[PDB]
Design a protein around this ligand. Sequence first.
Ligand SMILES: Nc1ccn([C@@H]2O[C@H](COP(=O)(O)OP(=O)(O)OP(=O)(O)O)[C@@H](O)[C@H]2O)c(=O)n1
Ligand SMILES: Nc1ccn([C@@H]2O[C@H](COP(=O)(O)OP(=O)(O)OP(=O)(O)O)[C@@H](O)[C@H]2O)c(=O)n1
Lengths: 417, 418
Amino acid sequence: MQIFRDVSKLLVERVDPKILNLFRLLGKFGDEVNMPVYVVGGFVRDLLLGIKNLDIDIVVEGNALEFAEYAKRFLPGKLVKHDKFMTASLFLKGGLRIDIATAEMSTIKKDLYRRDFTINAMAIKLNPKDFGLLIDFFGGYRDLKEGVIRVLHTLSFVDDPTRILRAIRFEQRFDFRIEETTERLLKQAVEEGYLERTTGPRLRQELEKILEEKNPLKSIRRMAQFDVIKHLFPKTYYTPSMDEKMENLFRNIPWVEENFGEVDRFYAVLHVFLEFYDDESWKEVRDRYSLRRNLINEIRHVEKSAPALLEMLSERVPASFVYPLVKGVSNETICHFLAYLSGEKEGLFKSYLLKIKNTKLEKINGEYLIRKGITSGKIIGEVLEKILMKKLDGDTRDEEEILEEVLASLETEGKLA
Amino acid sequence: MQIFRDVSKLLVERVDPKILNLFRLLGKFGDEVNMPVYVVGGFVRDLLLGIKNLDIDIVVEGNALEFAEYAKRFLPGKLVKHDKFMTASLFLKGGLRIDIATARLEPDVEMSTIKKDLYRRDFTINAMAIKLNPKDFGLLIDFFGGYRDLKEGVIRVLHTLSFVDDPTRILRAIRFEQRFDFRIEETTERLLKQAVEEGYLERTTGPRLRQELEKILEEKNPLKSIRRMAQFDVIKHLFPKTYYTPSMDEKMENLFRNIPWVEENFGEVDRFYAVLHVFLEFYDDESWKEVRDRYSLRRNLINEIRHVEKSAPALLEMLSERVPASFVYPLVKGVSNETICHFLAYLSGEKEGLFKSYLLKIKNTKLEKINGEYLIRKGITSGKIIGEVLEKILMKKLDGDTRDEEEILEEVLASLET
Ligand SMILES: Nc1ccn([C@@H]2O[C@H](COP(=O)(O)OP(=O)(O)OP(=O)(O)O)[C@@H](O)[C@H]2O)c(=O)n1
Ligand SMILES: Nc1ccn([C@@H]2O[C@H](COP(=O)(O)OP(=O)(O)OP(=O)(O)O)[C@@H](O)[C@H]2O)c(=O)n1
């Protein structure tokens, strides 16, 4: 179809002036040193979708270093010269970095063939002669305009399997869908075991992004269809009974964040993903990605403590009984428990969660009062804890609490004196 | 010669990047908004001379306003349009101004129209243009050999009637000669001398002339500019009763020699007014008004001028014999800074000296600090008497050292007597 289009009007309309002047200027610098200058990637895409974008990715046909230095004489900022990739980055002020990379000059075609998705292909030339020129050898404009995610060629995934997760994140991100031939090509690489053949850090960064994106649940369930879950983490199985927890997790994570603070979504997920894990299955998952020595312990905790919790929620036990299972736990671990709760139990587990968060306040009485009482050692802790454990269900004068509490220890023997 | 040169290399090497950027931008706007864009006039001259200029003249072929609004959309400044005789002026944060104008015929004949705009100008060195539009960024456009005239240092009008069209250029040409060390060439000198001989100065308006003179006096060597003026006879043709003779010219030298000393002691000196204090001395009431209402001069000028013009000889005798300083005060009383110059205009060496000191003594020590107009409420109420008493004790104090009060009771003998 059409390779060229005049987004020149669209540039001045959408793009902030301070930036336009940059594209304008960068283009002129191009001419001055004889290098075609293009802005590329996610900016082209975003400008087209009316979505704001500050990233200003740039390709030249010459030498990014030579160009980047020329640019600096007239642009104000820090020049970082990533030799060995012939890349560069001019750091201006206001919070702006121009990423400058290196490549019928249309060698930019070969450069745009190397990418993931037609909508992320495409380039806009910058040299004054061709200033507003949209370049689209692969009909990104078309897919962009009918919400499509096409992987430029049949080896896109083989060449880089991380695009498997990217493809998925883009769907939720822009609301687009993956056309058939990609869909087919994805599965093939997943099943070919291709993304196992890839590094931890890489698969994980991308995994994090998916979770930080618009809709997480939907993209995990999506990830499920394609059977990538099973291929990142060798033992997990996305069943109606694993999913269901996942749903629970994401429904109240907002509550967790509201009363307890940040929730590391990645981890919150691993919890449900990583359950029922033999030691040889974890020392690696943990090892391949970088999970926390021991995280395994914490998932187990909820895993094990789990059938006891709903019972404990049924039978409306006093909070005194719940504490043991949520005592210095992470927000992720709290989330994990919540993965189990539908409806009325939820309001309760939460109802105790705020009791246990609060009223932990001993007010007067601890540490001191006890040692003046003349007690020492690890005991102090247990007596303190067992006072508070009852202050969460009904309060006296917080002294009389001990004078009743130490007694309970006496005539069962507790220290001496 | 070469009508077209590529000075792109100079632009980047010799031009401050913030400006050299604004050029690139102004030229890109041009292409966007479809209009050739040039910088012209003074800047191009100065650039090629390696001189700094922050008054950038841009000429566009198209609407000037249109282009200016379109520029601001993308620039950080204040925009004043000037609607009739379309031209715009863009004030930028950097402390500089873009002056934007429509070329005005009202590849395709782009050069014709700009050449029309250039031919319209005063001198070759100022009739140059540099194209900003990206396609031709470096482009120096020089039809009239203004480039070669820079290197040769030559000043040259563009065509035979350059002076007939704007006789005010008679003065500009002398200015640029003293400003850069250039010499007005033969032909334009021939031409310059007619315009003045025939009377194109009297034919040009007063106010334009005065400004152009003020400019000549603010520039680098005014004495030279005035002498060059006198060599072309242009002085008689500005002021009909002033004859620039060895005497007047000695006065002028002494004047300009002293202005500086006078500035760093009495402050701003209007040099156009000082120079008039010489040009007009011994003017008659009639020829004075004539010239006053012609250059919108101050009305009590003539009195001050007559004041020196009448006492100069007295001042000369006083500074002779070294007459003590009580007697010269009344000559310098409450007079202009220029009036102070005008005197100095008559002086050189040793007299200039002793006269310098006097004026110090006079502004320097006129304290009367101890008394006031209280000491005078101690016995006297007359509106003129209070005022004379005071100016009386002053002069006593002007070259005499004594307490204060006790000289009042003392010189009040010369007063209570008679
Ligand atoms: N594994 C990858 C990563 C990136 N790209 C290409 O590089 C461009 C820029 O990478 P990135 O900045 O991550 O693109 P976006 O997804 O739009 O940016 P973000 O990840 O922040 O959303 C993409 O548009 C894509 O063309 C690719 O082909 N293969
Ligand atoms: N009588 C005049 C006055 C000006 N010009 C043109 O208009 C330009 C701008 O006028 P001006 O600002 O006075 O130029 P400069 O002499 O450089 O500025 P200045 O007088 O302050 O030195 C000049 O370069 C010249 O091309 C002209 O041709 N005829």
